[PDB]
Ligand binder design. Structure first.
Ligand SMILES: CCCCSC[C@H]1CN(Cc2c[nH]c3c(N)ncnc23)C[C@@H]1O
Ligand SMILES: CCCCSC[C@H]1CN(Cc2c[nH]c3c(N)ncnc23)C[C@@H]1O
Ligand SMILES: CCCCSC[C@H]1CN(Cc2c[nH]c3c(N)ncnc23)C[C@@H]1O
Ligand SMILES: [Cl-]
Ligand SMILES: [Cl-]
Ligand SMILES: [Cl-]
Ligand SMILES: [Cl-]
Lengths: 270, 286, 269
């Protein structure tokens, strides 16, 4: 029974889309999620929407633990998120989609495990594998769905997640390029890590909104530029989600989820 | 439009320089109309009292980063309180000095580096005023860092160093490490490959916060050692840094003393207006 | 008077090895060590054994308390063993690496005793890290590995990640480009703190996997690490046991004097 948690689900909380709507504030052993969980069906598939920043909060301080724990406890099998990001590559243009497959962690202040010694709900030490952080099957549906829509889309990409809330210096932007990063943001880590500990199939839709500050004869990133590009291109990620959702619903998952569950279980030392 | 014109003394309808690490400037021969003032901020107490006065007829505010008696690790300096206090005093500009390690052969111990970029290797440090917990700084601030250092100040610093005939480097990338330990040799080498030119423990987040405050910030970096990457050269130690600082402090002091009046006679309204705008348009609110 | 603190001393707590055994729980100004200190003689050399995980995630190990306790017991030397991932083809699972450098990728960890909050450690300490690992110990380790005929690497850079998660593949690749050779979760800040304490510290790294960078190879997992450790723990144990008496017979007065001076002259008061 597929149930899709959606974080950053641009415009999905709408009576024309979300049927049987219901809104639910929850508590978790890690605290309160960013906002109420919005429950309903989209194209006959059970979904749970969660707004990452609420509606106020810096990326460093988002309660990623509470957010993922809540989605797990609601019964989500899948999580699909959207994020804005900066492009670190010429061929990734503003407005393009990137179905990211890897990350580089540049965060510093963020808890990244549920298994923190302090919670009876998550006993022991968890060393979760991260060789493949993102759900391959969901990513493949995202890719094929983008092609069906005729959208500019990149099939793979490495996201460097910085601590923020400041944007990167130019020396930093250049060094990230040399480390192999393709796109840059402030939220992928530790969301992806925690979803993996929870045995959830997690994938990210990244939309490039600027070229950070590395580029020649190009204007550097600002809040205003991001906000304008998002406004011009949000419709893309929304169509992609909306078209992906029913395909997730009709796909077989038992083996995929069984392996995720085993991987998470055998990562824990008691 | 408006020209700032005078006629028979009358005009129709203001630089203040915060100085952090201001080597030897707290001296009656230099600082005229001295006054000393302990302050509170919404982010706590600054490292030390603010020393107020005029230097070559320009209003200045001196602040010791490690406090009087150099008692605090770079990780635990209250950068928020320091920058907020300088802002609240009315500083338009901040000029700091820092010691640093050289990562490049051509940056010799004793050389000045007018840095233009940084690489953050800190881990423990608040880097914004807009932290959700202060009514004085509401919302989320994503401040741009493409050009972290005030270009106009940097230019005056460069041209002033040339006038004095000092060995000086016009650009440079500072890697700021968390400390208080110095870098391993593997770290030192990797920093070189990332493009860092000098190394220290304080530039981040001082530079970031000044930018959020709409202050024109520049740094005078003085190389005191070659860190530990170098052949037929002895590695950094507290004692080597101290010795090199002592031999070379007169340089940064002259540089400042000669820069100060040039900042005072330069036009800033447009520069500060743009900084103010950049800071304002960085903040998100519902 | 040589006294060897041993962290991760796989199988040394045994009546056939540790003579005059005694077990001692201690308090330090930085809290409780991971576990009791096990005191005794191994091949007539005074040792102190400490179990690093006592259960506890690497981020939350009390490295300060562990090193302080070993210092307070009089340890002149610390020799540790660590599992690690290999970032190089020629460092095979089961190999020993006598590491000589580190790259810090930790974020949450106190790395000094001189934290402003302890009268036992007043002021600011800027310890040098050009040579984080005791050269003389390392040389004995290398020569001893050769005598035993073990596969051993004379140098190596350890990247210490925060954990508890393993690295992504993008991370694994980038660590290679930075010059790291092996990967773990504990070397930093253990090595740093031992240096502040004036202790000659060296590390025996045993590769247990190839992390996740490699082709035609299966990625790291808790189960793979554990299996490889089980098959190869004997090697580090024989190496320690054979190193210990050579440390005992070596002259150290100048080496320790210089470490003591280096630590002392690092402190601003
Ligand atoms: C209300 C809409 C406008 C928001 S602008 C600030 C957002 C954008 N987020 C992602 C983001 C896009 N480009 C980036 C870049 N170059 N570097 C790092 N992050 C990014 C992070 C952040 O919290
Ligand atoms: C005035 C007291 C001098 C004590 S020496 C330690 C000082 C020097 N600061 C800068 C500094 C110079 N060389 C460096 C190097 N190689 N790496 C990193 N920082 C540096 C950092 C620190 O707070
Ligand atoms: C006895 C417990 C075994 C559980 S496996 C997880 C252990 C192994 N430690 C070292 C370790 C080996 N391979 C590594 C890799 N690829 N990356 C990072 N650390 C490693 C870190 C950690 O605390
Ligand atoms: Cl880093
Ligand atoms: Cl983000
Ligand atoms: Cl510094
Ligand atoms: Cl480890």
């Amino acid at each position: 029974a597929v149930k899709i948690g959606i974080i950053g689900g641009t415009g999905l909380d709408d009576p024309e889309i979300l049927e049987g709507r219901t809104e639910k504030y929850v508590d978790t052993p890690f605290g309160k999620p960013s906002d109420a969980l919005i429950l309903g069906k989209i194209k006959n598939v059970d979904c749970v929407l969660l707004a990452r920043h609420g509606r106020t909060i810096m990326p460093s301080k988002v309660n990623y633990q509470a957010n993922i724990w809540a989605l797990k406890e609601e019964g989500c099998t899948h999580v699909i998120v959207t994020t804005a990001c900066g492009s670190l590559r010429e061929e990734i243009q503003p407005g393009d989609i990137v179905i990211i497959d890897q990350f580089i962690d540049r965060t510093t202040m963020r808890p990244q495990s549920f298994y923190d010694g302090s919670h009876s709900c998550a006993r022991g030490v968890c060393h979760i594998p991260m060789a493949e952080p993102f759900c391959p099957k969901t990513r493949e549906v995202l890719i094929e769905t983008a092609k069906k829509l005729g959208l500019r889309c990149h099939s793979k990409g490495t996201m460097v997640t910085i601590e923020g809330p400041r944007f990167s210096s130019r020396a930093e932007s250049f060094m990230f390029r040399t480390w192999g990063a393709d796109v840059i943001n402030m939220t992928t880590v530790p969301e992806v890590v925690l979803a993996k500990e929870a045995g959830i199939c997690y994938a990210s839709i990244a939309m490039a909104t600027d070229y950070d500050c590395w580029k020649e004869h190009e204007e550097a990133v600002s809040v205003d530029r991001v906000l304008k590009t998002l406004k011009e291109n949000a419709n893309k990620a929304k169509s992609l989600l909306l078209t992906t959702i029913p395909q997730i619903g009709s796909t077989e998952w038992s083996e995929t989820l069984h392996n995720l569950k085993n991987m998470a279980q055998f990562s824990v030392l008691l």
